[PDB]
A paper describes a structure:
L49 and I57 are both part of the folding nucleus in CI2 and very important for the stability of the folded state of CI232.
In contrast, introducing L49I, which on its own destabilizes by ΔΔGf = 3.4 ± 0.1 kJ mol−1, together with I57V results in a total stabilization of the L49I/I57V double mutant of ΔΔGf = −3.8 ± 0.1 kJ mol−1. Analysis of the pairwise interaction energies at the residue level suggests that much of the stabilizing effect of the I57V mutation originates from an unfavourable interaction between I57 and Q59 that is observed in structures of both the wild-type and L49I. The effect of the L49I mutation, which destabilizes the wild-type, but stabilizes the I57V variant is more subtle and not easily explained from the crystal structures. It appears that some of the destabilization of the L49I mutation is a long-range effect resulting in several less favourable interactions among residues 57-62.
Author numbering: 1 to 64
The structure:
Amino acid sequence: MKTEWPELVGKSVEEAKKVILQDKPEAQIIVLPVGTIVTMEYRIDRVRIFVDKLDNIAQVPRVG
């Protein structure tokens, strides 16, 4: 199962959403600022993306 998208570092949200959905059609994509205090249970259909001030992906999106 695809669990990580290193290829999306530096891309916009729109492009990250399009690529994650091709690879993971059930994905629930959640957009958060870098540095967000996160304690969350594991959800296998969720993909969190952490974004910078210009809404570019700052780190490697991962399932969870």
